[PDB]
Swiss-Prot record, chain A:
UniProt-reported outcome of changing residue 49 to A: Does not affect ability to cleave and inactivate human TRMT1
Intracellular or extracellular location(s): Host cytoplasm; Host Golgi apparatus; Host nucleus
Domain of life: Viruses
Subunit architecture: 3CL-PRO exists as monomer and homodimer. Only the homodimer shows catalytic activity. Interacts with host FBXO22; this interaction promotes the proteasomal degradation of nsp5.
Domain Peptidase C30: 1-305
Active-site residue list: 41 (for 3cl-pro activity), 145 (for 3cl-pro activity)
Recorded catalytic activity of this chain's protein: TSAVLQ-|-SGFRK-NH2 and SGVTFQ-|-GKFKK the two peptides corresponding to the two self-cleavage sites of the SARS 3C-like proteinase are the two most reactive peptide substrates. The enzyme exhibits a strong preference for substrates containing Gln at P1 position and Leu at P2 position
Chain residue numbers at which the record places covalent cross-link Glycyl lysine isopeptide (Lys-Gly) (interchain with G-Cter in ubiquitin): 5, 90
Effect of residue 142 to A: Does not affect ability to cleave and inactivate human TRMT1
Name of the protein in its database record: 3C-like proteinase nsp5
Chain's role: Cleaves the C-terminus of replicase polyprotein at 11 sites. Recognizes substrates containing the core sequence [ILMVF]-Q-|-[SGACN]. Cleaves and inactivates human TRMT1, preventing tRNA guanine(26)-dimethylation of tRNAs. May cleave human NLRP1 in lung epithelial cells, thereby activating the NLRP1 inflammasome pathway. May cleave human GSDMD, triggering alternative GSDME-mediated epithelial cell death upon activation of the NLRP1 inflammasome, which may enhance the release interleukins 1B, 6, 16 and 18. Also able to bind an ADP-ribose-1''-phosphate (ADRP).
Amino acid sequence: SGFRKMAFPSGKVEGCMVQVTCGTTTLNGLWLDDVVYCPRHVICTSEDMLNPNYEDLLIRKSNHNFLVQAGNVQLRVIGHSMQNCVLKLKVDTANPKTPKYKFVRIQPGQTFSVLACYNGSPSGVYQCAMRPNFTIKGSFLNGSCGSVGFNIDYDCVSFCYMHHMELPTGVHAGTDLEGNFYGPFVDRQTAQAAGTDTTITVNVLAWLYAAVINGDRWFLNRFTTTLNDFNLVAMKYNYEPLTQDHVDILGPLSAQTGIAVLDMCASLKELLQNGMNGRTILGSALLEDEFTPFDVVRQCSGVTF
Amino acid sequence: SGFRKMAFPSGKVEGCMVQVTCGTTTLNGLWLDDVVYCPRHVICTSEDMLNPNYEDLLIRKSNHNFLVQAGNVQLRVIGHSMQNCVLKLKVDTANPKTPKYKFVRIQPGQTFSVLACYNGSPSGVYQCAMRPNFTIKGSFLNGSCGSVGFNIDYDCVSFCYMHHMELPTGVHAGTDLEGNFYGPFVDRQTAQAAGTDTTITVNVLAWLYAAVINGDRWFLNRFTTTLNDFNLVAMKYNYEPLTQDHVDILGPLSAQTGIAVLDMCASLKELLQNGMNGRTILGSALLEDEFTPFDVVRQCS
Ligand SMILES: O=C1C[C@@H](C(=O)Nc2cccc(C3CC3)c2)c2cccnc2N1
Ligand SMILES: O=C1C[C@@H](C(=O)Nc2cccc(C3CC3)c2)c2cccnc2N1
């Protein structure tokens, strides 16, 4: 029993984290095979950050301007290039701890584990969702840039996120490992703001299924609904539309618990309209939207890595 | 900024997890140097579970009755002994991935990371606290026994928990790595039940200090309180007593934020009275009690 916000075990990623230094800037890099990946903003100083010309800053650098430290060992940089907003430093040694991996771009609503790091040293791991407004609600201080997010699908690490910056609201923005931002953000010091966020409906439903599986059933009711009626309610409460694909994805949980997705939608309708009436669900007084259907099934079935 | 329930990176522990089998029972063990630690109940059968006599079950076993698998490899067991409620299996290979480590017994309110494991392979990592009633609110299925809890302050892993069982209420009980249970529990399937659980007051206060550090002040008020009046009110909401030690421990957070500990106590009293009136603190609509003072300073500043 029990249901917790759970991250993937982080060991396979821990063996890839290094420190990257350029001038007076130190941040984290990801060392896979013979390349170190890190945010291209490592090459900027204070003045540069206001309006950087990255190609022009980069052409001025030699390999020896980038100091890469893996533990207590310096790696030799033998090449450098940029891909979108990530810098790729070719080094003279392949990482002997390189896991089986891929680079994947995730969709809003999908979850991943973040390994927060400082000076190339992993400090903490936590689970995040990519918000509908393409931010993440992370926990990051000065020095965390280049921290990465990932999933593990089998023995294969899927890297999906590299941390680039904090927005003024205190939420976080970054890129895939091919250097494309999630969201309408740019890597420069200027006023930027996230869009208004919405709640991830399919995930709330997943978590309601988790609650039922763990014995917490007070919110169930005799009623059902239709997709269109439910979506009018979702829109009113700043919930993402529920699609037929979402309904299909929750199919397993529906069959296991005997509660059809649109029956559970009728539960969720009532919760939005009436609140929780002083009760909790899985120890929370708000509706949790950072577990996917896959997360719920995985944790309520004991899958291993 | 931001504030998350954060676990330690699990890699140092992952490299120590093995599978232990005895008869038809398989669970997890922790392989450090040349010893594998696991719950002694691995040697029980169905019959045994109400009133096992562990010394009598153990004397009947040989080394070769214990199968230990580390990844794809069998380890050879060359010795065994029991210490309290843990079995220690001496094996013929020291674990080359053994981290710097120590065994520490923790007190209620302390937090740690759990690496949940099945068949000797890591499933997930999450953060837990030792509740005042000596249970933890974990996430554990059949096969999770022998999963461990730990902290990593610096490069040294401090092992503080090994998982043994789930109580009827769905909460979890286990031992330190010297095999002494937390709380009044025993490794038997007799009816046992945890004490009423209470809120960890010192941690709630820590987390209110975290909210102030992250720029949120809405819940403060102009009042203070004596320690004794605070405790008289807080007990009525099932909050643990706050002690002078706890007040001392909050001193650094007090000094960082400019808010005296007993003024923060006054804020908490009002929150218990009023609720949150549709607001949140660090993203929660309930008061959070699974961050320690030490955790707050580590994650914020
Ligand atoms: O998440 C973080 C990392 C880091 C940060 O946000 N840097 C940062 C901010 C704006 C723009 C840029 C770059 C693209 C041009 C980088 C930080 C420094 C100090 C305090 N908190 C944090 N939080
Ligand atoms: O945490 C867990 C592990 C495991 C469990 O609780 N085993 C267990 C229960 C009572 C007593 C004993 C031993 C000392 C005599 C062991 C379990 C089995 C089935 C369903 N859920 C779980 N949850």
